PDB file of C-alpha atoms in Angstrom:
ATOM      1  CA  UNK A   2     146.135 130.285 204.987  1.00 54.97           C
ATOM      2  CA  UNK A   3     144.452 128.834 208.123  1.00 58.29           C
ATOM      3  CA  UNK A   4     147.537 126.544 208.378  1.00 56.71           C
ATOM      4  CA  UNK A   5     147.408 122.837 208.619  1.00 57.88           C
ATOM      5  CA  UNK A   6     150.905 121.633 208.646  1.00 57.97           C
ATOM      6  CA  UNK A   7     152.046 117.879 208.255  1.00 57.78           C
ATOM      7  CA  UNK A   8     155.643 117.964 209.598  1.00 56.67           C
ATOM      8  CA  UNK A   9     157.562 115.048 208.039  1.00 57.66           C
ATOM      9  CA  UNK A  10     160.662 115.421 209.987  1.00 61.28           C
ATOM     10  CA  UNK A  11     162.019 115.965 213.669  1.00 58.48           C
ATOM     11  CA  UNK A  12     164.220 118.922 212.433  1.00 58.50           C
ATOM     12  CA  UNK A  13     160.947 120.557 211.063  1.00 58.42           C
ATOM     13  CA  UNK A  14     158.890 120.099 214.128  1.00 58.00           C
ATOM     14  CA  UNK A  15     161.430 121.512 216.491  1.00 58.21           C
ATOM     15  CA  UNK A  16     161.715 124.626 214.404  1.00 59.15           C
ATOM     16  CA  UNK A  17     157.908 124.957 214.089  1.00 59.47           C
ATOM     17  CA  UNK A  18     157.568 124.753 217.787  1.00 62.72           C
ATOM     18  CA  UNK A  19     160.549 127.315 218.415  1.00 60.49           C
ATOM     19  CA  UNK A  20     159.027 129.662 216.399  1.00 62.33           C
ATOM     20  CA  UNK A  21     155.791 129.456 218.404  1.00 64.83           C
ATOM     21  CA  UNK A  22     153.654 127.896 215.404  1.00 61.01           C
ATOM     22  CA  UNK A  23     152.654 124.531 217.121  1.00 58.54           C
ATOM     23  CA  UNK A  24     148.893 125.280 216.658  1.00 58.73           C
ATOM     24  CA  UNK A  25     149.570 125.009 212.852  1.00 56.08           C
ATOM     25  CA  UNK A  26     150.537 121.292 213.063  1.00 49.63           C
ATOM     26  CA  UNK A  27     147.927 118.888 212.172  1.00 53.14           C
ATOM     27  CA  UNK A  28     150.232 115.807 212.242  1.00 54.29           C
ATOM     28  CA  UNK A  29     153.993 114.889 212.673  1.00 54.68           C
ATOM     29  CA  UNK A  30     156.197 111.919 211.595  1.00 51.70           C
ATOM     30  CA  UNK A  31     157.298 109.089 213.949  1.00 53.08           C
ATOM     31  CA  UNK A  32     160.778 110.907 214.731  1.00 54.92           C
ATOM     32  CA  UNK A  33     159.124 114.164 215.723  1.00 56.89           C
ATOM     33  CA  UNK A  34     158.578 115.030 219.391  1.00 56.72           C
ATOM     34  CA  UNK A  35     155.499 117.165 220.364  1.00 55.07           C
ATOM     35  CA  UNK A  36     153.665 117.444 223.611  1.00 54.41           C
ATOM     36  CA  UNK A  37     151.214 114.746 224.584  1.00 54.01           C
ATOM     37  CA  UNK A  38     148.528 117.270 225.205  1.00 49.91           C
ATOM     38  CA  UNK A  39     148.379 118.264 221.365  1.00 50.98           C
ATOM     39  CA  UNK A  40     146.977 114.754 220.427  1.00 52.27           C
ATOM     40  CA  UNK A  41     148.820 114.990 217.114  1.00 52.31           C
ATOM     41  CA  UNK A  42     148.316 112.139 214.886  1.00 51.45           C
ATOM     42  CA  UNK A  43     151.539 110.413 213.450  1.00 54.43           C
ATOM     43  CA  UNK A  44     152.077 109.939 209.868  1.00 50.95           C
ATOM     44  CA  UNK A  45     154.711 107.267 209.973  1.00 51.33           C
ATOM     45  CA  UNK A  46     158.214 107.317 208.459  1.00 50.43           C
ATOM     46  CA  UNK A  47     158.631 110.222 205.988  1.00 50.98           C
ATOM     47  CA  UNK A  48     160.180 107.660 203.503  1.00 48.84           C
ATOM     48  CA  UNK A  49     156.787 106.072 203.373  1.00 49.94           C
ATOM     49  CA  UNK A  50     154.103 108.570 203.521  1.00 51.45           C
ATOM     50  CA  UNK A  51     150.648 107.391 202.673  1.00 50.54           C
ATOM     51  CA  UNK A  52     148.850 109.667 200.155  1.00 47.58           C
ATOM     52  CA  UNK A  53     145.194 108.961 201.178  1.00 50.66           C
ATOM     53  CA  UNK A  54     146.271 108.824 204.878  1.00 48.90           C
ATOM     54  CA  UNK A  55     147.709 112.448 204.645  1.00 47.91           C
ATOM     55  CA  UNK A  56     144.800 113.588 202.618  1.00 43.62           C
ATOM     56  CA  UNK A  57     142.223 112.758 205.262  1.00 43.49           C
ATOM     57  CA  UNK A  58     143.900 115.430 207.369  1.00 43.18           C
ATOM     58  CA  UNK A  59     143.073 117.980 204.867  1.00 42.74           C
ATOM     59  CA  UNK A  60     146.490 119.591 205.154  1.00 46.21           C
ATOM     60  CA  UNK A  61     147.710 122.557 203.445  1.00 47.57           C
ATOM     61  CA  UNK A  62     151.460 121.887 203.697  1.00 47.66           C
ATOM     62  CA  UNK A  63     153.598 118.734 203.831  1.00 48.71           C
ATOM     63  CA  UNK A  64     157.124 120.008 204.948  1.00 49.65           C
ATOM     64  CA  UNK A  65     159.977 117.749 205.216  1.00 46.28           C
ATOM     65  CA  UNK A  66     163.458 116.871 203.834  1.00 48.31           C
ATOM     66  CA  UNK A  67     164.300 115.814 200.332  1.00 46.48           C
ATOM     67  CA  UNK A  68     163.791 112.218 201.550  1.00 45.88           C
ATOM     68  CA  UNK A  69     160.142 112.632 202.009  1.00 46.56           C
ATOM     69  CA  UNK A  70     158.425 109.933 199.792  1.00 47.11           C
ATOM     70  CA  UNK A  71     157.548 108.008 198.003  1.00 49.60           C
ATOM     71  CA  UNK A  72     157.376 110.458 195.093  1.00 50.41           C
ATOM     72  CA  UNK A  73     154.113 108.995 193.867  1.00 53.29           C
ATOM     73  CA  UNK A  74     152.509 110.019 197.081  1.00 51.26           C
ATOM     74  CA  UNK A  75     153.910 113.424 196.868  1.00 47.68           C
ATOM     75  CA  UNK A  76     152.468 113.998 193.421  1.00 47.27           C
ATOM     76  CA  UNK A  77     149.012 112.992 194.682  1.00 47.97           C
ATOM     77  CA  UNK A  78     149.266 115.644 197.350  1.00 47.49           C
ATOM     78  CA  UNK A  79     150.686 118.247 194.977  1.00 47.82           C
ATOM     79  CA  UNK A  80     147.946 117.472 192.186  1.00 49.70           C
ATOM     80  CA  UNK A  81     145.493 117.798 195.032  1.00 49.26           C
ATOM     81  CA  UNK A  82     146.876 121.331 196.013  1.00 45.65           C
ATOM     82  CA  UNK A  83     148.822 120.457 199.040  1.00 45.61           C
ATOM     83  CA  UNK A  84     152.036 122.714 199.406  1.00 45.01           C
ATOM     84  CA  UNK A  85     155.034 120.206 199.467  1.00 43.99           C
ATOM     85  CA  UNK A  86     158.008 121.829 201.029  1.00 42.78           C
ATOM     86  CA  UNK A  87     161.419 120.295 200.648  1.00 42.42           C
ATOM     87  CA  UNK A  88     163.512 122.016 203.299  1.00 41.22           C
ATOM     88  CA  UNK A  89     167.284 121.878 204.271  1.00 41.26           C
ATOM     89  CA  UNK A  90     169.031 118.929 205.630  1.00 38.02           C
ATOM     90  CA  UNK A  91     172.622 119.559 205.768  1.00 35.72           C
ATOM     91  CA  UNK A  92     174.888 118.716 208.608  1.00 34.14           C
ATOM     92  CA  UNK A  93     176.130 122.356 208.743  1.00 31.80           C
ATOM     93  CA  UNK A  94     175.328 125.168 211.073  1.00 32.49           C
ATOM     94  CA  UNK A  95     174.289 127.262 208.054  1.00 31.87           C
ATOM     95  CA  UNK A  96     171.803 124.540 207.221  1.00 31.63           C
ATOM     96  CA  UNK A  97     170.222 125.270 210.394  1.00 31.95           C
ATOM     97  CA  UNK A  98     170.105 129.064 209.815  1.00 29.98           C
ATOM     98  CA  UNK A  99     168.592 128.272 206.384  1.00 28.19           C
ATOM     99  CA  UNK A 100     166.197 125.807 207.781  1.00 27.95           C
ATOM    100  CA  UNK A 101     164.888 128.366 210.229  1.00 32.35           C
ATOM    101  CA  UNK A 102     164.304 130.868 207.486  1.00 34.57           C
ATOM    102  CA  UNK A 103     162.569 128.338 205.369  1.00 29.77           C
ATOM    103  CA  UNK A 104     160.147 127.393 208.021  1.00 29.98           C
ATOM    104  CA  UNK A 105     159.571 130.799 209.361  1.00 31.98           C
ATOM    105  CA  UNK A 106     158.524 131.847 205.795  1.00 34.83           C
ATOM    106  CA  UNK A 107     156.062 128.970 205.521  1.00 34.60           C
ATOM    107  CA  UNK A 108     154.453 129.372 208.927  1.00 36.74           C
ATOM    108  CA  UNK A 109     154.572 133.196 208.681  1.00 35.91           C
ATOM    109  CA  UNK A 110     156.758 133.551 211.781  1.00 38.88           C
ATOM    110  CA  UNK A 111     159.653 135.477 210.198  1.00 37.87           C
ATOM    111  CA  UNK A 112     159.252 138.032 213.228  1.00 38.51           C
ATOM    112  CA  UNK A 113     160.795 135.138 215.342  1.00 38.63           C
ATOM    113  CA  UNK A 114     163.557 134.191 212.996  1.00 41.65           C
ATOM    114  CA  UNK A 115     166.155 136.736 213.717  1.00 41.79           C
ATOM    115  CA  UNK A 116     165.685 136.224 217.551  1.00 40.15           C
ATOM    116  CA  UNK A 117     165.885 132.553 217.071  1.00 35.02           C
ATOM    117  CA  UNK A 118     168.982 132.622 214.669  1.00 34.19           C
ATOM    118  CA  UNK A 119     170.434 134.821 217.103  1.00 33.30           C
ATOM    119  CA  UNK A 120     170.088 132.614 219.885  1.00 28.68           C
ATOM    120  CA  UNK A 121     171.439 129.840 217.619  1.00 29.00           C
ATOM    121  CA  UNK A 122     174.543 131.840 216.839  1.00 30.68           C
ATOM    122  CA  UNK A 123     175.012 132.770 220.406  1.00 28.67           C
ATOM    123  CA  UNK A 124     174.920 129.156 221.596  1.00 25.48           C
ATOM    124  CA  UNK A 125     177.447 128.349 218.786  1.00 24.97           C
ATOM    125  CA  UNK A 126     179.793 131.209 219.880  1.00 27.14           C
ATOM    126  CA  UNK A 127     179.372 130.116 223.488  1.00 28.98           C
ATOM    127  CA  UNK A 128     180.405 126.710 222.380  1.00 31.65           C
ATOM    128  CA  UNK A 129     183.312 127.784 220.233  1.00 30.42           C
ATOM    129  CA  UNK A 130     184.373 130.182 222.957  1.00 27.94           C
ATOM    130  CA  UNK A 131     185.112 127.128 225.190  1.00 29.17           C
ATOM    131  CA  UNK A 132     187.448 125.639 222.460  1.00 27.88           C
ATOM    132  CA  UNK A 133     190.906 125.041 223.841  1.00 28.98           C
ATOM    133  CA  UNK A 134     194.213 125.336 222.242  1.00 28.31           C
ATOM    134  CA  UNK A 135     194.721 121.476 222.752  1.00 30.62           C
ATOM    135  CA  UNK A 136     191.448 120.078 221.684  1.00 29.11           C
ATOM    136  CA  UNK A 137     190.683 116.393 222.623  1.00 30.28           C
ATOM    137  CA  UNK A 138     189.588 113.610 220.353  1.00 29.86           C
ATOM    138  CA  UNK A 139     186.188 112.481 220.059  1.00 26.59           C
ATOM    139  CA  UNK A 140     184.528 109.879 217.865  1.00 27.09           C
ATOM    140  CA  UNK A 141     180.967 108.938 217.315  1.00 28.38           C
ATOM    141  CA  UNK A 142     180.104 105.306 216.811  1.00 27.33           C
ATOM    142  CA  UNK A 143     177.051 104.019 215.221  1.00 27.83           C
ATOM    143  CA  UNK A 144     176.505 100.621 216.602  1.00 25.16           C
ATOM    144  CA  UNK A 145     174.011  97.896 215.554  1.00 23.15           C
ATOM    145  CA  UNK A 146     173.122  94.442 216.695  1.00 23.76           C
ATOM    146  CA  UNK A 147     175.031  92.098 214.181  1.00 20.27           C
ATOM    147  CA  UNK A 148     176.288  95.060 212.096  1.00 23.31           C
ATOM    148  CA  UNK A 149     179.777  96.344 211.878  1.00 24.14           C
ATOM    149  CA  UNK A 150     180.494  99.215 214.142  1.00 26.36           C
ATOM    150  CA  UNK A 151     180.349 102.340 211.922  1.00 25.18           C
ATOM    151  CA  UNK A 152     181.821 105.815 212.414  1.00 27.17           C
ATOM    152  CA  UNK A 153     180.829 109.336 211.553  1.00 27.82           C
ATOM    153  CA  UNK A 154     183.259 110.936 209.163  1.00 26.37           C
ATOM    154  CA  UNK A 155     182.948 114.187 207.443  1.00 28.27           C
ATOM    155  CA  UNK A 156     179.635 115.633 206.509  1.00 32.70           C
ATOM    156  CA  UNK A 157     177.623 114.184 209.409  1.00 31.73           C
ATOM    157  CA  UNK A 158     175.613 115.843 212.155  1.00 31.92           C
ATOM    158  CA  UNK A 159     177.836 114.018 214.646  1.00 33.89           C
ATOM    159  CA  UNK A 160     180.837 115.446 212.993  1.00 38.48           C
ATOM    160  CA  UNK A 161     179.696 119.104 213.215  1.00 36.94           C
ATOM    161  CA  UNK A 162     178.715 118.555 216.866  1.00 37.47           C
ATOM    162  CA  UNK A 163     182.146 117.235 217.743  1.00 35.69           C
ATOM    163  CA  UNK A 164     183.684 120.314 216.060  1.00 33.54           C
ATOM    164  CA  UNK A 165     181.400 122.663 217.925  1.00 30.57           C
ATOM    165  CA  UNK A 166     182.094 121.151 221.379  1.00 31.71           C
ATOM    166  CA  UNK A 167     185.870 121.970 220.503  1.00 31.23           C
ATOM    167  CA  UNK A 168     187.108 118.588 219.811  1.00 29.54           C
ATOM    168  CA  UNK A 169     188.743 116.913 216.869  1.00 29.44           C
ATOM    169  CA  UNK A 170     186.946 114.258 215.054  1.00 27.65           C
ATOM    170  CA  UNK A 171     189.893 111.727 214.217  1.00 27.98           C
ATOM    171  CA  UNK A 172     187.616 110.164 211.543  1.00 31.01           C
ATOM    172  CA  UNK A 173     186.586 113.505 209.766  1.00 32.13           C
ATOM    173  CA  UNK A 174     189.418 113.892 207.274  1.00 31.98           C
ATOM    174  CA  UNK A 175     189.679 110.302 205.901  1.00 31.41           C
ATOM    175  CA  UNK A 176     186.029 109.218 206.292  1.00 33.30           C
ATOM    176  CA  UNK A 177     183.204 110.683 204.564  1.00 29.67           C
ATOM    177  CA  UNK A 178     179.670 110.019 205.876  1.00 27.81           C
ATOM    178  CA  UNK A 179     179.086 106.972 207.915  1.00 30.37           C
ATOM    179  CA  UNK A 180     181.370 104.015 207.205  1.00 34.95           C
ATOM    180  CA  UNK A 181     182.600 100.877 209.076  1.00 32.36           C
ATOM    181  CA  UNK A 182     185.629 101.800 211.252  1.00 31.28           C
ATOM    182  CA  UNK A 183     188.447  99.413 210.956  1.00 30.54           C
ATOM    183  CA  UNK A 184     189.489  98.079 214.545  1.00 28.69           C
ATOM    184  CA  UNK A 185     193.030  99.466 213.424  1.00 26.45           C
ATOM    185  CA  UNK A 186     191.785 103.026 212.686  1.00 27.79           C
ATOM    186  CA  UNK A 187     190.213 103.186 216.031  1.00 27.62           C
ATOM    187  CA  UNK A 188     193.206 102.100 217.780  1.00 26.33           C
ATOM    188  CA  UNK A 189     195.094 104.745 215.691  1.00 27.21           C
ATOM    189  CA  UNK A 190     192.707 107.638 216.408  1.00 27.24           C
ATOM    190  CA  UNK A 191     192.903 107.052 220.045  1.00 27.73           C
ATOM    191  CA  UNK A 192     189.630 108.812 220.983  1.00 27.35           C
ATOM    192  CA  UNK A 193     189.509 110.377 224.547  1.00 28.26           C
ATOM    193  CA  UNK A 194     185.706 110.155 224.375  1.00 29.17           C
ATOM    194  CA  UNK A 195     183.345 107.968 222.284  1.00 30.97           C
ATOM    195  CA  UNK A 196     179.738 109.162 221.702  1.00 28.90           C
ATOM    196  CA  UNK A 197     177.194 106.374 220.881  1.00 29.88           C
ATOM    197  CA  UNK A 198     174.406 106.046 218.319  1.00 28.94           C
ATOM    198  CA  UNK A 199     171.681 107.559 220.484  1.00 26.28           C
ATOM    199  CA  UNK A 200     171.129 107.359 224.265  1.00 26.08           C
ATOM    200  CA  UNK A 201     168.823 104.583 222.751  1.00 25.41           C
ATOM    201  CA  UNK A 202     171.689 102.349 221.473  1.00 22.08           C
ATOM    202  CA  UNK A 203     171.759 100.864 224.828  1.00 19.83           C
ATOM    203  CA  UNK A 204     169.808  98.298 224.518  1.00 16.70           C
ATOM    204  CA  UNK A 205     173.243  97.082 225.745  1.00 17.46           C
ATOM    205  CA  UNK A 206     173.631  98.300 229.255  1.00 17.25           C
ATOM    206  CA  UNK A 207     175.838 101.354 229.055  1.00 17.33           C
ATOM    207  CA  UNK A 208     179.507 102.304 229.120  1.00 16.34           C
ATOM    208  CA  UNK A 209     180.936  98.993 230.276  1.00 15.60           C
ATOM    209  CA  UNK A 210     178.540  97.254 227.868  1.00 16.65           C
ATOM    210  CA  UNK A 211     179.546  99.097 224.720  1.00 18.30           C
ATOM    211  CA  UNK A 212     183.092  98.344 225.907  1.00 18.35           C
ATOM    212  CA  UNK A 213     182.008  94.810 225.865  1.00 21.58           C
ATOM    213  CA  UNK A 214     180.666  95.484 222.390  1.00 24.71           C
ATOM    214  CA  UNK A 215     183.809  97.011 221.154  1.00 24.33           C
ATOM    215  CA  UNK A 216     186.681  95.426 222.914  1.00 23.55           C
ATOM    216  CA  UNK A 217     189.406  97.295 221.101  1.00 24.19           C
ATOM    217  CA  UNK A 218     188.273 100.537 222.904  1.00 25.90           C
ATOM    218  CA  UNK A 219     190.239  98.943 225.795  1.00 23.51           C
ATOM    219  CA  UNK A 220     193.374 100.432 223.932  1.00 23.51           C
ATOM    220  CA  UNK A 221     192.066 103.897 223.725  1.00 23.30           C
ATOM    221  CA  UNK A 222     191.794 106.579 226.374  1.00 23.40           C
ATOM    222  CA  UNK A 223     187.990 106.564 226.162  1.00 24.64           C
ATOM    223  CA  UNK A 224     188.011 102.769 226.640  1.00 26.77           C
ATOM    224  CA  UNK A 225     190.388 102.689 229.472  1.00 27.14           C
ATOM    225  CA  UNK A 226     188.494 105.592 231.301  1.00 24.05           C
ATOM    226  CA  UNK A 227     184.909 104.162 230.248  1.00 24.20           C
ATOM    227  CA  UNK A 228     184.342 107.533 228.882  1.00 25.66           C
ATOM    228  CA  UNK A 229     181.504 106.492 226.736  1.00 23.50           C
ATOM    229  CA  UNK A 230     178.758 109.018 226.525  1.00 24.01           C
ATOM    230  CA  UNK A 231     175.264 108.884 225.211  1.00 26.41           C
ATOM    231  CA  UNK A 232     173.952 111.532 222.720  1.00 27.09           C
ATOM    232  CA  UNK A 233     170.290 111.955 222.056  1.00 22.90           C
ATOM    233  CA  UNK A 234     169.411 110.400 218.537  1.00 21.53           C
ATOM    234  CA  UNK A 235     167.031 113.148 217.850  1.00 23.81           C
ATOM    235  CA  UNK A 236     169.849 115.681 217.713  1.00 20.55           C
ATOM    236  CA  UNK A 237     171.308 113.763 214.867  1.00 19.71           C
ATOM    237  CA  UNK A 238     168.329 113.727 212.542  1.00 17.54           C
ATOM    238  CA  UNK A 239     167.209 116.246 209.958  1.00 16.88           C
ATOM    239  CA  UNK A 240     170.295 117.330 210.620  1.00 17.93           C
ATOM    240  CA  UNK A 241     171.919 119.968 212.644  1.00 17.87           C
ATOM    241  CA  UNK A 242     169.241 121.619 215.002  1.00 15.59           C
ATOM    242  CA  UNK A 243     168.328 123.161 218.427  1.00 17.20           C
ATOM    243  CA  UNK A 244     168.657 119.691 220.180  1.00 19.60           C
ATOM    244  CA  UNK A 245     172.009 119.208 218.544  1.00 19.03           C
ATOM    245  CA  UNK A 246     173.205 122.458 220.152  1.00 18.96           C
ATOM    246  CA  UNK A 247     171.766 121.511 223.462  1.00 20.27           C
ATOM    247  CA  UNK A 248     173.315 118.026 223.457  1.00 18.02           C
ATOM    248  CA  UNK A 249     176.669 119.620 222.267  1.00 15.24           C
ATOM    249  CA  UNK A 250     176.741 122.088 225.233  1.00 12.92           C
ATOM    250  CA  UNK A 251     175.715 119.079 227.630  1.00 15.05           C
ATOM    251  CA  UNK A 252     178.566 117.024 226.152  1.00 13.19           C
ATOM    252  CA  UNK A 253     181.174 119.786 226.059  1.00 13.85           C
ATOM    253  CA  UNK A 254     180.691 120.121 229.870  1.00 13.56           C
ATOM    254  CA  UNK A 255     181.517 116.379 230.159  1.00 15.95           C
ATOM    255  CA  UNK A 256     184.550 116.700 227.870  1.00 15.34           C
ATOM    256  CA  UNK A 257     186.059 119.693 229.451  1.00 17.75           C
ATOM    257  CA  UNK A 258     185.312 120.314 233.047  1.00 19.40           C
TER     258      UNK A 258
END
């Protein structure tokens, strides 16, 4: 077990690094972030893994979400003796704690698990501690060029993050997962703050530009105050992770000075 890990997801990579086991990585996926110094090869998109491409890395593990595929490549790895570990990808805090356990076990760093799960819970408590009696309203908008403006309802990492910063997600009862948000619902929900599909979804300009993009925000507090805030897209993938918690803190400071 001289480890050679292909990490197939950003949420895998961060934990592997957090547990001090970066020397075990031989490759990461496109969404993963690792220091330039490591010279780690990429492996593309975990939904389109190349069986032979992976095999040349002589890996011992392929770790990712249940979205790793295609399945025909996963069998070629298994049949060749590569451990293929499907790992948690909920939008829940317990999903994160479970993910930490799943990784700590594979990478044999259980020792670090408790202390890391402990920090994770501390941050969450620190975030929850700052929740007011009168929480504000926050929506996450998933915007694309030529696509209809979507929203994160229940069971999304952006929904969990909004709860953790101590806000209401007005979309979270009525909407499940990511759905088109009717202009009327948005007007009705009256968000105080809008979060946008990555810091990277601009590509538009910024606050005033997303406002240009979604002109009905003008009839919400968020719009009339240009309170349109960027959240790092990596904190939304895999799903609820260390980056998620860090963004959440950073955004709560913006939402409640």
